Structures are given as C-alpha cells and as structure tokens.
Amino acid sequence: QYVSFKAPIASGSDGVTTIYVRYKDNGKVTYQLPIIVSGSTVNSQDRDIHIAVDKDTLKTLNIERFSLYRPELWYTEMEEDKYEFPETVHIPAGSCVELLNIDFNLQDIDMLEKWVLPLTIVDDGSYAYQKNYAKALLKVVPFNNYSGSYTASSMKVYTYINGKPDTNARTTDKRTGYVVDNNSIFFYAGLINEDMDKDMRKKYKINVHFKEDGTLDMKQDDPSNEMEFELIGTPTYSSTSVMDATRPYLERRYVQIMFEYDFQDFTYGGSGTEVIPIKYRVAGSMTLLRNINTQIPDEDQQIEW
Template sequence: MKNYIVYFLMSGLLLTNAACNDEWEDEVYYQNIALKAVINSEGVTNIYIPYEGNGEFVYQLPVIVGGSQINESNLDIQIEVDKDTLKDLNTERYKLREDLYYQELPQANYELPSAICHIPAGEWQGLYDIKFKFSGLDLRHKWVLPLTIVDTDAYDPNPRENYRKALLRVMPYNDYSGTYSATNMKIYIGDDKYSMAMDKRNLFVMSENRCFFYAGNISEELIDREKYKIALTFNEDGTITAESVDPNNKMNFEVIGQPTYTTRVMEDATYPYIEHHYTTINMKYRYNDISTYEDYAIPNRVEGSMSMERKLDTLKPERDQIQW
C-alpha cells in the first residue's frame, strides 16, 4: 500500500514539473515585438525633447524583440498612428472633463520618415525615428502622438496593449522649464497678513527662452485655468518679462517691480561627473481670483522665489535625463 502511495506522489510531481517546464519554455522562447514606451500614472509616456532653435528634433523610439533566443530573421516592423486608443484613454480617464483631454499631435508637427522599423537578424532592438516640429504648435496644450504596431504575418506583436502601443506625450524642455520648489513663494489673499504657499510649480515651454505657469495657488486642472497663465520671458541680462497669456487679462495680472532669475552650476561633492544646475526665480505680482465666486473677484498678492535643480550626469546626453 505504501508503494502505491509513493508511486502516485512521484507521478504527480513529474507531471507538475513537466507542465511548469512547458509553460516556462513558452514564455521565455516565444518572440514578439513591443514598443518600449512605459506608461505613467496618467496613462501616457512622457518623452522629454529639447526645444531647439529651429523647432525640430528627431526622437528615436525603441522597438524590441522579446524572448531569450537570438533573433534569426531580418524584421521590418510596421508602425502607424493609432487615433482610437487616444480617444479611449480620454473617455475612460477624464469622462466629461473634455478640457483635460489629451490632444492628438497635428500631422503638420511631426514626420515619420519611414513606415517601418528595421531590426537586422541577430539584433534584439531597433530605433524608430520620429521627427517633431514645434513651429506653429501651441505648447499650452497636452499633445500626444499615438502609435501602434501593425499586424502582419511576418512577426507577432506583443498581445498586451500597453506593449504594442505607445501614447507619446510630447514634453519639450528648455533651460528654464521643469518643476520648481515654490514653498518660498508666499501667497496673500487681500490684505491678509498670513500667507500660504504651494509645494511646487511647473513651468511649461512656450519657446526657446519662454515658459508659462499658473498664478498663485491655481490648480493645473481648474476648468478656468487658461485665464491664469503667466508667461515668463528669460532675458540675457538676468531679468524676466512677465505677462498674462490671456490677451484680455481677465485676472488683472500686474507685476510688482522687476522679476529676475539666476542660474548656477555646482560640481557634486562626491561624484565629479555629476553637476547640479540651479535656476532661481524672484518675482512679485498681483492677480484676481475670478473663479471662486461668480460675482466677486478675490485679490491675491504673490511674492518670493521659486527654485529648480537639475542633477545631470555629464557622461550621458542631457535629453536622456530631463524628467519633471
């Protein structure tokens, strides 16, 4: 009787191991094609592109062959624009808040030099060129270029949607854009002596030396946020020209004194190849909150400084390190 029990236990163990081994082999050796575009918490992939003087930049999207075996074939991966996935993302994430929707990048502002990405035999990755053109593009909006791998008999796209598709959120940057610590930028309501502050403020690119941010404590998701955009032009003499982006200046934006900025670079105390780039903005201004109450504008006064740090490895390209 004991021998029968041992026999059945051994048989079950062998069958289990065989099943596990087969599943492992399927997962490891099966080759499929994917786009390397890891999504963030907002459902898109931020790509940080330097705003060049001519307004153009070529971005290379990695296209990957999965599996552990060597790729033995020359592969021509077809890639095309995928409008439907972007529409689905907007509907599922933002529902009726169409003001928060990602906008599809206009065709005039990008160029796909080729419809395919070639991956030679023996290689596991190819780079797909995308030329972005910022001329005439209103960078105040959230632009996304949605791409997907096309089904063909020549290869197998990764079955997981987040691997075969890429929603590229175009994030241009210049020397002054990024996330600033704003705890030293004090916000006063009316004649109140007590102030409040925001933890951080984002500066978004408008051109090579121009950015915008939202006034005071205005949320970046406020329905009326367009009324509160402040444009900053960084002049070569260290001064800043500040003005309301809204041509009607409904928030009654007013600069107090002369805004200025400073930049400095410091070598890391431990690693000499690491540089710390600091940008500090000093300014005072007034604006009215015209959204909280329908018939009453709340005067606000803001004064202080905002600072940003970029920690850069001088051994790597700058564009591969900018994230904010």
C-alpha cells in the same frame, strides 16, 4: 517572437510613457524610439514593420483613468502638424533592433494640453498575422533650460481685503513652468489650479522670458488681460551650479526666479458664472532644480528626470 517599442523608461501608473525632448532651434527636434524584436531565437525574418497613430487607445485610456466627467484631466492626441515618422521600419534577418525616427516640430506648441502620441504596431512583419498589438503612449514633454517643476515654498500669495493685501499669506509646495520656446516658459498665476477647466485656466498664463542680462520679462498671455495682471518692480533670475557631496559626479543646477505681481481670479465660481473677482498679491521666489550626471557629456542624455 514578439515585436515591441522600448522607451528609455517604463510606462507610468496608467500606461503612458513620458518622453523629454529639448526645444531647440525653431523647435525642430528628433526623437528616436527603439523597435525591438524579442525572442529566445535569432530573428530569421526580414520584417517590414508598420506603425500607425492609434486614436482609439488614447480615448479608452482617458475614460478608464479619468472618467467621462473629468475631461479637464484628459490626454490630448498630438496634432498631425506637430510630428512625422515613417510608416514602415525595416529590420533585416539577423538583426533585432532598429530606430523609429520621430521628427517633431514644436514651434508654437501650446503646453496647456497634456500631449500624447499614441503609436501602435499594426503589423510585426512576420508571416500571415490574422491578435494583441504592441503599443506606445508617448507623453511628449518639451523642455528648455528653464522648464519643469519649480519649488514654490517661498512664493507667498496674499488676498486683497478692503483694498490692501492681507497680512496672512497662502503657499503651495510647487508650480509647473511649461515651455513656450527655447528661452521662454509660462506659469499659471498665483495658486490657480493647474488642472482646472481648460477654457478658464488658459486665461491665467503668465509668459516669462529669460534675458541675457539676468532680468525677466513677465507678461500675461491673454491679450485682453482679463485677470488684470500687473507686474510690480523688475523681476529677476539667477542660475547657479554645484556638485553634490555624496554623488561626486552629480551636478545640481538651480534657476531661481524673483518676482512680484498682482492678479485677479474671476473664474472660481465655475464656468459661465460671473463672480466678484478676488485680487491677489503674489510675491517671492521659486527655484527650479536640474540634476546632471557630469560623467555624460551630451546635454540631453545627462539629465536625470
């Protein structure tokens, strides 16, 4: 008999399982990860299963998938102050499933990092035991009603040429809005590469807060505003929902944000080099879609990621 974890979905291309947790009140939220005892026979042993954080597996993955020369793409071990779970789970004889309640404290989580909580089963509760251990690499993705991958086809980015925005504009197909708290997220300015050197990419964060009246606050995260961020006008948002025609139960929820700002990219030359800043005017809208199975009433479970 083999004891293992069962996340809601299969692990991705490299071995990481993405889990979605809602940022709620002061950001404390619980995630329940099933521990399963698989076998042809009925589990006939009382099993005290031991779980431990596995520093090493994560490092190995990073090297294998991204190499030593691309640390900017590496996963980062979740901080000890951000989670708790019991070291031992008890599965009585006659049972074969029990839940590992992982309790997260997401307050002030910095989603610049791709956080991963690596869990390994260091003892499956069976007699003797000393071969090959069950693992779970949880990529924890907090979310609120305003986070995820925004379609960005209507966002235009103009280069300042001779002190005025050029007539030609660049665009990309999507931008990621990361959670800050229950009703705030952040994006990286303009078309800044979301996988760029971390020390520099953090400098281009734009915090966005959704207000009750349908207006956004948008402000650079960097207190010294090195990117010279400058909001133009008053940014706006709208939330709308319709049912799909084909899947009558499917609710499609749209959050569209409208904005216009200036900023400068001053890190395009690489780390530790001072370069002439390239100023950009960013203008248009982005829209986030959220697909919901109405047949399910629970607000978290109903989302189809």
